[PDB]
């Protein structure tokens, strides 16, 4: 695909910054409902 | 000297040798000289099997 | 977490999207070896002769 | 331009094994992406700039 004009772009968020906010709303809801 | 006649056509294979087709393309001496998927200009820089 | 260990298909929603823009990108690639009624799909091969 | 064929990119030493009837390889894409030298007979990979 690359050769021919074709790329793929990275997102804005990484995995890790997702799953950072992941963890924030578990421990929201625990901690505090 | 002697060509084929048009109902016995003479089929001579070309090969393994160097072409150069600026001698006829620039010879005044023919009066048809037609190509058909490629240009007289650009057949002097191509290969063929 | 057991569930979804032993089960292969429990993601496939998530995998049809992957597949499908796969697909899509493959078909797009695939049609650059289309003649569309030219001579060649390649064009380096129109413009040398 | 090898053999009549013309393009641009990076030659690298290729590590594909080539038949002895084989001169080139294509991608799917219809491109060629390997070619064998006429003179040396060694393959080279072909990548765009
Ligand atoms: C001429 O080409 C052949 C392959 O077709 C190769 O084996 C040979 O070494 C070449 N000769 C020279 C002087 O490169």
Known sequence: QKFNGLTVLPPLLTDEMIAQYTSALLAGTITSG | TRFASVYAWNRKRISNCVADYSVLYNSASFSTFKCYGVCPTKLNDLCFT | ?49 | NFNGLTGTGVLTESNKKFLPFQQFGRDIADTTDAVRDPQTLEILDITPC
Not at chain 3, 10 to 35: E, M, P
């Open chain 3, 1 to 49: 977490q057991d569930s979804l260990s032993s089960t292969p298909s429990a993601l496939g929603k998530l995998q049809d999207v992957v597949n499908q823009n796969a697909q899509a990108l493959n078909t797009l690639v695939k049609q650059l070896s289309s003649n569309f009624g030219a001579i060649s799909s390649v064009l380096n091969d129109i413009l040398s002769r």
